[PDB]
A = this chain, B = another copy of it.
Amino acid sequence: NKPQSWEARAETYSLYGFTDMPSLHQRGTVVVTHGEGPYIVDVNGRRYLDANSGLWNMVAGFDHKGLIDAAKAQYERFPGYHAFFGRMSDQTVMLSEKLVEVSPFDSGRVFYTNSGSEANDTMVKMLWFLHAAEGKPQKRKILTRWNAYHGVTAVSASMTGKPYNSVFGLPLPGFVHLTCPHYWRYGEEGETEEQFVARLARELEETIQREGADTIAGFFAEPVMGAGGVIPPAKGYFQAILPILRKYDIPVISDEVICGFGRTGNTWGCVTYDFTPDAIISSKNLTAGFFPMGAVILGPELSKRLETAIEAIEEFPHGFTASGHPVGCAIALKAIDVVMNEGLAENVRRLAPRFEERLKHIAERPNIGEYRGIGFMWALEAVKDKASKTPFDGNLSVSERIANTCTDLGLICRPLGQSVVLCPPFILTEAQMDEMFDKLEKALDKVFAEVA
| Pairwise interchain contact A290-B327, C-beta atoms closer than 8 A | yes
What B residues does A19 contact at CB under 8 A?
84-86, 315-316
What B residues does A296 contact at CB under 8 A?
15
| Pairwise interchain contact A79-B292, C-beta atoms closer than 8 A | no
Q: What CA separation (Å) do A31 and B19 show in the bound complex?
A: 42
| Pairwise interchain contact A121-B153, C-beta atoms closer than 8 A | yes
* Interface stretch (choices A89-97, A239-247, A374-382, A435-443): A89-97
Interface size, A (range): 35 or more
Q: What CA separation (Å) do A322 and B114 show in the bound complex?
A: 9
The 8 Å CB contact of A17, one of B15, B27, B72, B83, is B83
What B residues does A298 contact at CB under 8 A?
15
The 8 Å CB contact of A100, one of B13, B31, B303, is B13
What B residues does A354 contact at CB under 8 A?
none
The 8 Å CB contact of A140, one of B15, B79, B169, B311, is B169
| Pairwise interchain contact A86-B154, C-beta atoms closer than 8 A | no
Q: What CA separation (Å) do A27 and B418 show in the bound complex?
A: 58
Is A393 engaged at the interface, CB distance under 8 Å to the other chain? no
| Pairwise interchain contact A290-B13, C-beta atoms closer than 8 A | no
CB contacts under 8 Å to B, within A142-170, are 151-155, 157, 162, 164-165, 167-170
Is A395 engaged at the interface, CB distance under 8 Å to the other chain? no
Instruction: Across the interface, name the chain B residue whose C-beta is closest to A173.
Output: B173
Using known A-B contacts A75-B71, A75-B290, A125-B157, determine if residue A18 contacts B321 with beta carbons closer than 8 Å: no
Using known A-B contacts A58-B80, A83-B16, determine if residue A114 contacts B118 with beta carbons closer than 8 Å: yes
CB contacts under 8 Å to B, within A37-54, are 40, 43, 54
The 8 Å CB contact of A110, one of B15, B31, B34, B320, is B15
What B residues does A76 contact at CB under 8 A?
68, 72
The 8 Å CB contact of A34, one of B78, B117, B170, B172, is B78
Is A261 engaged at the interface, CB distance under 8 Å to the other chain? no
| Pairwise interchain contact A81-B68, C-beta atoms closer than 8 A | no
What B residues does A326 contact at CB under 8 A?
32
Instruction: Across the interface, name the chain B residue whose C-beta is closest to A154.
Output: B155
| Pairwise interchain contact A81-B93, C-beta atoms closer than 8 A | no
What B residues does A118 contact at CB under 8 A?
114-115, 117-118, 153
| Pairwise interchain contact A79-B75, C-beta atoms closer than 8 A | no
The 8 Å CB contact of A22, one of B167, B306, B314, is B314
Is A129 engaged at the interface, CB distance under 8 Å to the other chain? yes
Instruction: Across the interface, name the chain B residue whose C-beta is closest to A3.
Output: B97
Q: What CA separation (Å) do A172 and B181 show in the bound complex?
A: 31
Is A356 engaged at the interface, CB distance under 8 Å to the other chain? no
Q: What CA separation (Å) do A109 and B14 show in the bound complex?
A: 5
Is A451 engaged at the interface, CB distance under 8 Å to the other chain? no
Is A198 engaged at the interface, CB distance under 8 Å to the other chain? no
B-contact bits for A61-85, CB 8 A (1 contact / 0 none): 0111001100110011111111111
What B residues does A212 contact at CB under 8 A?
none
Instruction: Across the interface, name the chain B residue whose C-beta is closest to A164.
Output: B317
Is A202 engaged at the interface, CB distance under 8 Å to the other chain? no
Q: What CA separation (Å) do A165 and B86 show in the bound complex?
A: 20
Q: What CA separation (Å) do A217 and B141 show in the bound complex?
A: 25
Additional A-B contacts beyond A15-B110, A291-B327 (20; CB < 8 A): A14-B110, A18-B84, A18-B316, A20-B86, A29-B88, A29-B93, A30-B86, A32-B78, A33-B90, A58-B80, A68-B75, A72-B75, A125-B168, A128-B169, A140-B169, A153-B155, A164-B315, A167-B313, A172-B172, A283-B321
On A, residues with C-beta under 8 Å from B are 6, 9-10, 12-24, 27, 29-35, 40, 43, 54-55, 57-58, 62-64, 67-68, 71-72, 75-90, 92-93, 96-97, 99-100, 107-111, 114-118, 121-122, 124-125, 128-129, 132-133, 137, 140, 151-155, 157, 162, 164-165, 167-170, 172, 283-284, 288-292, 296, 298, 303, 306-307, 310-311, 313-323, 325-328, 414
A–B Cβ pairs within 8 angstroms, 19 of them: A10-B88, A10-B93, A18-B315, A20-B85, A30-B87, A34-B78, A35-B78, A55-B82, A57-B321, A71-B71, A71-B79, A72-B76, A125-B152, A129-B167, A132-B168, A164-B315, A284-B321, A289-B322, A291-B322
Closest 7 CB pairs of A and B: A17-B319, A114-B114, A13-B96, A292-B322, A15-B109, A164-B317, A80-B289
